[PDB]
């Protein structure tokens, strides 16, 4: 089973440096080309660089020439992307692949920003008191003002999954993100069941459980 695993992504300042690694399993990188390919938030796939580990020959996209360096260590079956003079435009999920590109890793997220990490506040979206008796009620949590992406949300520690909608994050005018997670439940359960959203913002090491009451 061929596998490719990227690591090293995260949040960095503009003009900074970051090194990504691509660990290969199930094949030897001496026998192939290794590529880096990226996908910026809503921009489509863009090839970044290629290397032939056997002789170290490299090719680069014009957009990263000089300031990025792709390398490999065949004794570690691992390839690397050293990124320098980082720009906002470099913000992307970075994938490594091998040569068509028949296998890809899951990718690692790189965010280039001057902004500091900020944990979210979590606010309840309480089910309405004019909710139809014997019908369906909606409730949720607002996970507001965090940076960077991503946030995860579960309900009742994962025991509640049916009828949950966790929305894609919204970038607010402030440059901070916000998102909602909602769930629809029977009206008859509002005074008898407890509903807790479990919010994780790993970039700030923030875990919050918020009880949503009628």
């Amino acid at each position: 089973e061929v596998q490719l695993v990227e690591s090293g992504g995260g949040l960095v300042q503009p003009g900074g440096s970051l090194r990504l690694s691509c660990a290969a399993s199930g094949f030897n990188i001496k026998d192939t080309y290794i590529h880096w390919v990226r996908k910026a938030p809503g921009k489509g796939l863009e090839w970044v660089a290629r290397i032939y580990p056997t002789n170290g020959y490299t090719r680069y996209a014009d957009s990263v020439k000089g300031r990025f360096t792709i390398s490999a260590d065949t004794s570690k079956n691992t390839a690397y992307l050293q990124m320098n003079s980082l720009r906002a435009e470099d913000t992307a999920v970075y994938y490594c692949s091998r040569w068509a590109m028949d296998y890809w890793g899951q990718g690692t997220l790189v965010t280039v920003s001057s902004a500091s990490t900020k944990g979210p506040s979590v606010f309840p979206l309480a089910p309405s008191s004019k909710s139809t008796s014997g019908g369906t009620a909606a409730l949720g949590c607002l996970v507001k003002d965090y940076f960077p992406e991503p946030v995860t949300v579960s309900w009742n520690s994962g025991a509640l999954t049916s009828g949950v909608h966790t929305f894609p994050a919204v970038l607010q005018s402030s440059g901070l993100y916000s998102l909602e997670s909602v769930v629809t439940v029977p009206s008859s359960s509002l005074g008898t069941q407890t509903y807790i959203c479990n919010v994780n913002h790993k970039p700030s090491n923030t875990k919050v459980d918020k009880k949503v009451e009628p």
Partner: protein
Amino acid sequence: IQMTQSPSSLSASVGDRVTITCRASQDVNTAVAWYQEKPGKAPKLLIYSASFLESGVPSRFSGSRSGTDFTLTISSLQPEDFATYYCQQHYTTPPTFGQGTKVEIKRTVAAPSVFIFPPSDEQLKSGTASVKCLLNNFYPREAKVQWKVDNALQSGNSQESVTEQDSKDSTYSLSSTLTLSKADYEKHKVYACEVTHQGLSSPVTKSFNRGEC
């Protein structure tokens, strides 16, 4: 060498015949591949060298070339084939990708259920105010949200978020947020979300009176 891909999206039913095309700006011979991508997943190779099926890729997928144009065909669409597809030329360096084509699943019209949420007392205490309108499990995706504050039409102070198609009933859900300063919020009384959608005989309005339990 640019890869012009069409269309950007399409809706289809299981069993359908689907056609995605890719126009290269200049000659690329047969050095073309097609990839399938799904949210948060590794892209996957479907077809290599224009027309060759990758091992393990079902024989419902096919690719062909005529001149500068490359075509990805799915003979009979299966449930797992809902995804985004990209073409790629590797004729020269740099290899380049099409803009992608999102294949979504067509279903019957379904009207949204609508809910409105006042800013929580907790948010109000922390210093801000967000009013929200939820549109739950609707199809098709196209939907209009109109905010009203004391019957006055709002413009340019709201943001929307929309889910991807639900993996069980193929619908969309939408969250709309009206943004106001806390001081502005308390200057008005009746907050209203008016929803227009094909599944609605006439637009539905949900509202609350500020402060009412």
